[PDB]
């Protein structure tokens, strides 16, 4: 790339990486397996302003009811351990569109 080499922000060491990291495992252990059995998956996009941003894959995102049910299930699970989670947001993050 060009002679810039400057980052305004950085992942890994994020806003409260303690919360961020335990969300990653709460997905990978509890949520991701369940969604994958239905024929989808959840990709952790981040945690910002108390909003856990997740990319939803097919089957789950294909049916509008399944979007709401999945988002709410993940939300309530995360809120139980982490009261910092006020919300969860479905972000279709894929630059092919």
Curated annotation (Swiss-Prot):
Region (NifU): 23-91
Superkingdom as given in the UniProt entry: Eukaryota
Residues annotated for [4Fe-4S] cluster binding in this entry: 60, 63
Tissues in which the UniProt entry reports expression: Ubiquitous. Expression in adult lung is weak compared to fetal lung.
Signal sequence region: none
Effect the entry attributes to changing residue 40 to R: In MMDS1; uncertain significance
Subcellular location field: Mitochondrion; Cytoplasm, Cytosol
Pathology noted in the entry: Multiple mitochondrial dysfunctions syndrome 1: A severe disorder of systemic energy metabolism, resulting in weakness, respiratory failure, lack of neurologic development, lactic acidosis, hyperglycinemia and early death. Some patients show failure to thrive, pulmonary hypertension, hypotonia and irritability. Biochemical features include severe combined deficiency of the 2-oxoacid dehydrogenases, defective lipoic acid synthesis and reduction in activity of mitochondrial respiratory chain complexes.
Biological role: Iron-sulfur cluster scaffold protein which can assemble [4Fe-4S] clusters and deliver them to target proteins.
Protein name as it appears in the record: NFU1 iron-sulfur cluster scaffold homolog, mitochondrial
UniProt organism field: Homo sapiens (Human)
Taxonomic lineage of the native organism: Eukaryota, Metazoa, Chordata, Craniata, Vertebrata
Gene behind this protein: NFU1
Residues represented out of the complete protein: 162 to 247 of 254
């Amino acid at each position: 790339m060009g002679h810039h080499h400057h980052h305004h922000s950085h992942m890994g060491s994020e806003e409260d990486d303690g919360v961020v990291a335990m969300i990653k495992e709460l997905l990978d252990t509890r949520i991701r397996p369940t969604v994958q059995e239905d024929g989808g998956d959840v990709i952790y996009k981040g945690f910002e302003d108390g909003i856990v941003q997740l990319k939803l894959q097919g089957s789950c995102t294909s049916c509008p009811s399944s979007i709401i049910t999945l988002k709410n299930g993940i939300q309530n699970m995360l809120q139980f351990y982490i009261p910092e989670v006020e919300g969860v947001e479905q972000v279709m993050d894929d630059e092919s569109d």
